[PDB]
């Protein structure tokens, strides 16, 4: 299948300009894919913003203004309010009935508690190995915007197997926090020298490394 | 909120400029039409006015070699260069069947294309999914305009849409869709479509929400004031129509043949109600210069036409006798061929339902200016036909009293003698002359085909009866002394290009066997 | 005025059939398209199915091809979805949204309904310690915690030294592992100096299975 | 080195078994032909002989609904199931144009398909590149056998091959390519192709290297001894032909419509010389059972035919008068329609160049067994026609003396008034009866269309002149009392299936206007 | 573009049977691609072997016999001679003019006994770094047959960029030998912990590792 | 008897045009197809171009599309290839081969001809040492050498201690780096005992630029 790829997260200053793009894995996005953007308050019914690529829907503010940049459909927010901090979904209709969503772009506009993450990487336990399970715990604390990408590796080799990652969750101090688990087998844990948890946060990559 | 609306219709793929009667361009200095010309005047307006819309209402798809060659691709890659805003589907858009619309146009076309009354079922439904839309919300300035589409339910009788397409009643299908526009805070709603001036007016009346109606299909011409050419108006432009809820709804239409560009300033209130509506269809006389950058892209494509002139269209297995000493005196097979191609071409791609049963044709010898030889390889190219029909006329449809028809047939032999190419080669007619009698009392038998009769036969012509007949424009305008037609004709609609009509007939027949079969006799 | 409500709500075991309804009001139901969209909690949006205006046309996503069956009833202004052969990847929020006949668009969205399909047994937590590595702390302290793995009835309480330590503790959100079993951790930052001096025992209570483990954490 | 050669030709897509005259199968017990049947007998032979080749020489394409529906794909996915070894291209393989050969067949076909005298130029050249080959080296046992293809240079006159295919003179193009086989130690060289029994013999004579010639196109039947059915032989099988270098070259050919399977044991020396050549074409009568596993795969495909029966083919805009009390008494438009479809169908897909000039048709009323009503969206489906032409006959071509033609036209009215279906609906004829006169002296005028009088006109019938005419097989067999035809006919070739001929004409015309136009008159 | 993929190298007992296959990256191979096999003694004009898939050419030995196995065209050499130690090219014609060859299969027959390889890996020099170039030298010795696969690793990360590998070259002792160079930048050499040269010979994988 | 002769592609600098000829004899040239195939030395076979018999049809590979022009002259039983806009990936052996029309064979092949297209310019080698750290050869001995990088002779001599050591020496094949410049190494196996005891100096001569470097090799 074909993936609609749109930025995973963005941050903007209040009263700023920001553009979300939304591209197609194989080929360009044109008008004749009928682009279409939605605002979802996390955990709420997604409200419409713009259909046709350009057309604003009933009672959509004029600050929101859709376009196309080269390969990708686009959404320009000229003059952000604090009212706009939510998740934005792009989505195209390649006809025959075939409709496909984007991954969703999380747009943050707070007023500058802007703090990089605190990563605490734990091995599988004294005792856990002995139960024949083997779980790598990677903890994140004290970051804003509250949008992270958790990459795992072994000795410079990516792992896509058995990775589970929580949704970021505002702490007791209005900064975001999230955990990331990697379930493994005692073999795979001893076979590779060291495992690493790579957390990236507004281009600020943070790693930690553990081995027996 | 003023909204200038540029509209066209029934353009019949006349991409290069024509002459006033919509034939081949003759006097360079005096020619009209052209998409070169049109571009100029549209760009002039857009560079002046702030609120402009450029619409078409179909029949863009048949007429010249241009289509016969590029088959809809010429349409797209030029309409896209003029930067149209929306278009509706036509009687003639399905002449190449659905995929001769869906492939060349609906996919390659860079602007939305509408009709709401056309629904597909089965597997075509998935293929065609959202290449043809029922309405469009087209933003102009800081406001939005709704445009709703329609297409004549007559289409399956004048085209080849396959059996997967349904044509719902215009009114039925529009109402629920116009209502949705108001459901989504669109106050300003244009109707745009190809059902005929008649239905356009019934849309005004019987569909609430609808503010403006732009139509075509009927070659009808609306002017306020003095007509700027031979075009006879049949109402003021715009044509106001009193709606049932009690609104003034302006209904518009350019002639056809890309001769006149529609021009209508519509002023709206804050809630999407028509308050003012004034303007007149801009004629494209030679005083508008043709845009160069387009006239270039025209001549770039001109080359693949020239290439088609020499290509074998199909083959004859008989001599096509077109010499003076044949077609100007007695019944020649060439005539019989052409007339048959004229009628046949008409009953596939009929312009309106009024002509879908037309079985009568006439043709002067003085339009048949060459024979075509078989001996070579039996091969027949376009260039061959250019020798036969070098006048680049059209085949037009005329409604005629039998009295008038009799008159013209006596004028076929009143001054017999030498070449005088007024002798009529007929199709769907049996005639017999007795030359012994007085000039103007020589037609002793004249049986014609009465199709508006259950199983059609040749029944003798009644001088009272009205007769729907196809013939060259040369004759509709009283060529070779035929003043009695130009005067006593009842209806006259310009048709397709003469050569293009044969070249199609020959292509689709592939093998011709045009015989002399006793349509015309003596005693 | 216009809205869409859905029905479904419940939890079901993998395989069983399940029907979904979407009660519409305040518009010409007769005219608009009607879709189903799902959203796996935390994850993005996925297109499910669609029913058009006249009936003829129904389309489904490659992901639920012929596993799922959509049906519209304009007689009753309600949309239906028959979901046979369920699994864990179908666990998500299920919205019905209307489409105007435009770009076949999506103006109005429903409140949405929750589809949870698991084996879903009432679980005791596996508890494990977490080896206090000085690799996160600088100013003469180290971070250590305890892992609460594989449990089902949320919530689970976590104290430290019978709740005689609330200072420096950072218990985390539970993750929902693809098996429909929760797992979380609870970390606490303490000084290096108290290794041989002070004892750290994390205490878990999970009254929904009455499992109340109390595991010590040593280097 | 003994080599059994199974060969077919002019199978004319008769996929399911027919009757002796190549029509619809009637008497289950007595039917012949079939690919079900053929499979059986070929499998029997392959399980007996060690050295077998199964060849075809074209005209596989045109014939039944089978093709009209699957358009060549039925051919491939069956010939591939029969496990043919080679095939040549035919007069009729280009009836659907190049793409109606290249798409359905040349892509789907799992065995080599040859013609060496067909050269493609321009862009088609690249597309078609090596899907049709000039020659093929087919290894049999421990030896190797070369097979050369050819196709009639007359193909462009009997098909629609596009203008990008050239047809070189068979002999010219074969010679240089046969030489290359000997250049590659191939001693044993079969020629295989569709140019007509006549050219096949001139290939034997004039082309060195060539050991055996397998042809078709002419439908010609060769038998050594007593013919096992109505099939009149015209030479022994094989037909030995004295080459110019002075060798004995056996030339073969099965009767057309997949009735006879060719069977020829050829014994070679160790350097590729024919020493022995004996055998006779195996007639496929009902004593050979139809194979079950194929008769299954036949009825699997049967279903998509039934589906096409109810689909709209095209439309009429007139009543098709086919009632007994019309077509059995006076000139009815249905007849005029059919006759026209019979002739027209013939001049596109002509079987040989002898019939490319056929302008004359006759049809008994007792073959027109229903009318077709319009006004119901004007629709005409296959099922409609099945009611009109339920006999599942064919339209055959007969050469006839004027004397004989006159005789049959008097038998049109000899004992008129009851007319148990004797009355002739004509095409390419003007006839006039005076009923007052003696039965067998009632035809007062009979003008017919002359075959190559330069420009085709209606000249009075001379009883000395010979006349090439199409008519139903019911009448070529002297059905409603026409013993005068069955006896005094000069040539008789079976044509295509009756219903299939109309259904095509209607499809390709799309809109029909069949009128009563005074072919038949009284006093 | 489409790659015709045929086995990289093969080994056979004299008087033994071996089959070379030849597949298409995208789709199956049928007869209607007109398979076609060639013998090249490396650096002589390649002798034709088999056209049509099955047809032998004039004076081709009978031991060579072409076929089709499922997805791939094939060449069976039933009864190998010493005469058959050559490089064998498959090739298919996808029409429009388009002909595409195979990578070539190098067929080794008995000469020696099967000796596994000897890898000596060198770092970039004291002095080389200072010229701003940085070249990893990997040497191979004393293996039979003469067909090796040279894999490089960054840590557990493949690199195929800037790797140059010589043609195997019969030594002074009738066993084969070849070098493999990897051009790098002084940054790339220090950035990654350790670089490895992985050589595999008849399934017999040999690695060596070097780091700053 | 039947034969194909190619025509001499020598050496040329990138960009220049170059015409290639293929003289056929001993068959109806008039009848068969005629191709070009190239072979980059050490690499596989690549299809270049084709001319068929009836004339209209000439086809090229996407790799040499409109860069190359093929032309047959039946008047003179010779096939031609016009190679404009050359580069280093065109450096290869260029064979002309016949095809019979039938099962679209490639019958008969030429001996072939060589096309070498480079920035010819004759460079002295960069020489560097190679670290004798005991981790390649068994407990008793160690391996050390010297790297000869970037040079444009094919040929270059390597001795050890002025050629006073032939025992344990294993000089390797030159590689042709993508720059069209050669590079090689020369290793020698010696005892661990002589690292601190004996001096090893690899000596390079490359008489085609007269550059004669003499680099010592010590452990680190
Ligand atoms: C199907 O075709 C086969 C092959 O022709 C038929 O078998 C053949 O039948 C004919 C007529 O019965 C036989 O000819 C007769 O031969 C006898 C002597 O055997 C002679 O006394 C008769 O006067 C006549 O010449 C022919 O020999 C026989 N051939 C074989 C293969 O035995 C078969 O009858 C046909 N079946 C049907 C129902 O058409
Ligand atoms: C092209 O059309 C325009 C508009 O009809 C012509 O301009 C008019 O000419 C008439 C006669 O001279 C005047 O009475 C009108 O007042 C003019 N109108 C305007 C707005 O200029 C123009 O002459 C035509 N050109 C040609 C040569 O046909």
Short mmCIF file of C-alpha atoms and ligand atoms in Angstrom, two decimals, chain D residues 29-30 32 223 226 228 283-288, ligand 1:
data_model
loop_
_atom_site.label_atom_id
_atom_site.label_comp_id
_atom_site.label_asym_id
_atom_site.label_seq_id
_atom_site.Cartn_x
_atom_site.Cartn_y
_atom_site.Cartn_z
CA UNK D 29 -25.60 -38.11 -32.21
CA UNK D 30 -24.36 -37.02 -35.72
CA UNK D 32 -18.76 -33.14 -36.20
CA UNK D 223 -8.12 -36.76 -50.27
CA UNK D 226 -12.98 -42.35 -51.16
CA UNK D 228 -15.68 -40.00 -46.04
CA UNK D 283 -12.52 -36.57 -40.39
CA UNK D 284 -13.69 -35.82 -36.81
CA UNK D 285 -17.13 -37.55 -36.74
CA UNK D 286 -19.17 -38.37 -33.59
CA UNK D 287 -17.48 -41.81 -33.23
CA UNK D 288 -14.58 -39.84 -31.62
C1 LIG G 1 -16.67 -42.17 -38.61
O1 LIG G 1 -15.61 -42.24 -39.56
C2 LIG G 1 -15.00 -43.53 -39.66
C3 LIG G 1 -13.86 -43.46 -40.66
O2 LIG G 1 -14.40 -43.20 -41.96
C4 LIG G 1 -16.04 -44.55 -40.08
O3 LIG G 1 -15.46 -45.86 -40.20
C5 LIG G 1 -15.58 -46.25 -41.58
O4 LIG G 1 -16.94 -46.43 -41.98
C6 LIG G 1 -17.07 -46.67 -43.38
C7 LIG G 1 -18.55 -46.80 -43.72
O5 LIG G 1 -19.16 -47.73 -42.81
C8 LIG G 1 -16.31 -47.93 -43.76
O6 LIG G 1 -16.41 -48.14 -45.17
C9 LIG G 1 -16.97 -49.44 -45.41
O7 LIG G 1 -15.98 -50.47 -45.33
C10 LIG G 1 -16.55 -51.77 -45.46
C11 LIG G 1 -15.46 -52.82 -45.25
O8 LIG G 1 -14.86 -52.61 -43.97
C12 LIG G 1 -17.17 -51.90 -46.85
O9 LIG G 1 -17.75 -53.21 -47.00
C13 LIG G 1 -18.26 -50.85 -46.99
O10 LIG G 1 -18.85 -50.92 -48.29
C14 LIG G 1 -17.61 -49.48 -46.79
O11 LIG G 1 -16.61 -49.28 -47.79
C15 LIG G 1 -14.85 -47.79 -43.37
O12 LIG G 1 -14.15 -49.00 -43.67
C16 LIG G 1 -14.76 -47.49 -41.88
N1 LIG G 1 -13.38 -47.30 -41.50
C17 LIG G 1 -12.90 -47.79 -40.36
C18 LIG G 1 -11.98 -46.88 -39.60
O13 LIG G 1 -13.18 -48.91 -39.96
C19 LIG G 1 -17.19 -44.56 -39.09
O14 LIG G 1 -18.20 -45.47 -39.53
C20 LIG G 1 -17.76 -43.15 -39.01
N2 LIG G 1 -18.85 -43.12 -38.05
C21 LIG G 1 -19.98 -42.48 -38.33
C22 LIG G 1 -21.16 -42.85 -37.48
O15 LIG G 1 -20.04 -41.64 -39.21
#
